[PDB]
Design a protein around this ligand. Sequence first.
Ligand SMILES: Cc1cc(C)cc(Nc2cccc(-c3c(C)nnn3C3CCN(C(=N)N)CC3)n2)c1
Length: 123
Amino acid sequence: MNPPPPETSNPNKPKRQTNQLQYLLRVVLKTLWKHQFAWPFQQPVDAVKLNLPDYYKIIKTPMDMGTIKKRLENNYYWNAQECIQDFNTMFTNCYIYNKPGDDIVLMAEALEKLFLQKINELP
Ligand SMILES: Cc1cc(C)cc(Nc2cccc(-c3c(C)nnn3C3CCN(C(=N)N)CC3)n2)c1
């Protein structure tokens, strides 16, 4: 079964809007979203759909770009580093669950390099 997806709202959490967070949504997230390798990462891993009973047995801090996008739209984050950490968790989860050379790992490796390129242009 699927655990609940990561929260995208938390009324007691303190929140911020910064120019860097705006850029993370407008440029980083929305450009990576359009990449030809982005599709596996656009929503939480659905272990029922994918017949993956051990995905959430192995991955304890799941993360995906749909969650990140919703978090940015809801101003969920305090700073850009907190959002950047979610991207890094998404990529590392993919390496943890899969194997070197797998198609999904090649996709994450390409997306991670593009992500780092865009982070260098943070205002
Ligand atoms: C057979 C296949 C290959 C590929 C490249 C993608 C898919 N579809 C999707 C859709 C949404 C998320 C994922 C995903 C993420 C994120 N992280 N891992 N995955 C899977 C886990 C199981 N898996 C395996 N080889 N046991 C493949 C990679 N994959 C299915």
